[PDB]
Symmetry: D2
């Protein structure tokens, strides 16, 4: 939901995701990672299902961060894919792909995979 | 690589990715999938490294499609995470995650993973 | 970690992983899934690092289940890749890939990804 | 597909996968990687669907390598999950997860994902 997703989210690492959901299905915001080659806030953009099912299924969504801002450039990008689950203990359950720019000889080693769970309460 | 990425791309399935790269690192555009629960064009947004390394490595990028447009809603979203490699054989090499909305009981089964390679012809 | 890995483990879904670690780095056992329409026990085999680092690093391992037994055949296989953490909170943190047999036209839709955490306590 | 799968396979990196498929669903063999922290052959074990569908679907399978042999220990393991596709041009299409032993604080960064296609030729 628009005002379900909009706001501040924390994952299990202590990273902070501040997002605004548009009526169209846009997500826009900033991300601050607690870990990795990262400092301060990075722009994010994504999309969500702006007319989800009302059968107790989650709301599908995804977003991207390119790890370039006015401090640092890690030459990498992370995408989170997952769903917003509402009601009590609201959460966004995600899996993510982090791709680093590599030479083609090393492209086999370009991409990390993991899982982040975001909650409304600070961990 | 604003000029390198901006344009039409095709993956191995015949899906069509039309993207504009902004100087600020933004990606915006439309995606049309050759497969799945998909009809016509869907909005995409993403981000790329607008100041890449100068050493021959690729340009990292990612984008999202939520599979809702004016025709159809599949209650799902896909993210592609990858890199742009330039030249005459320019390609975008990606891996993707497609999450469908599920109940919490079925959340273990929410997410498909695959790989798409996009090129400028075909 | 031969003694550490050997045992009965449960994940967050209530699945049961019974495994014996061999000195050679072998894992052998049975898996019972609580979800995904599996029935009874399936054979598993895998490998672990039989000489891990001593710095507090986890022990890397992986195993495979093909979802065929005497009762049922899902025409699929799951692999788990992860690490065993020792000491007080002994856990195996994994990500997994579940591939189903598909036609070539449908191969894009062959593979689910997820994450399982296994502990010796049943949830 | 016992004899379909049994034998020598090569991926796009020049790695070599030598495998024996048992009647009982077992896979056993050796793996030699062309890349990464790897020298000589490593033991693999896995499983495959020993009674696949007859509808033109591939045969599901998976295997594991822990990257420790007589020569080296990388403190990591890779699992490949995929399917064997027979007929005219035989291939094993896989995705893989490579997990390195890490501390708990660094476990976010433990796992690489990729895709390997193995063919009969080369
Ligand atoms: Fe690395
Ligand atoms: Fe499905």
């Amino acid at each position: 939901d628009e005002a379900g997703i909009t706001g501040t989210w924390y994952n299990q690492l202590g990273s902070t995701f501040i997002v605004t959901a548009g009526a169209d299905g846009a997500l826009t915001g900033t991300y601050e990672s607690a870990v990795g080659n990262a400092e301060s806030r990075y722009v994010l953009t994504g999309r969500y299902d702006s007319a989800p099912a009302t059968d107790g299924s989650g709301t599908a969504l995804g977003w991207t961060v390119a790890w370039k801002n006015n401090y640092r450039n890690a030459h990498s990008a992370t995408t989170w894919s997952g769903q917003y689950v509402g009601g009590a203990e609201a959460r966004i359950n995600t899996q993510w792909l982090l791709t680093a720019g590599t030479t083609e000889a090393n492209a086999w080693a370009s991409t990390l995979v993991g899982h982040d769970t975001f909650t409304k309460v600070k961990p």
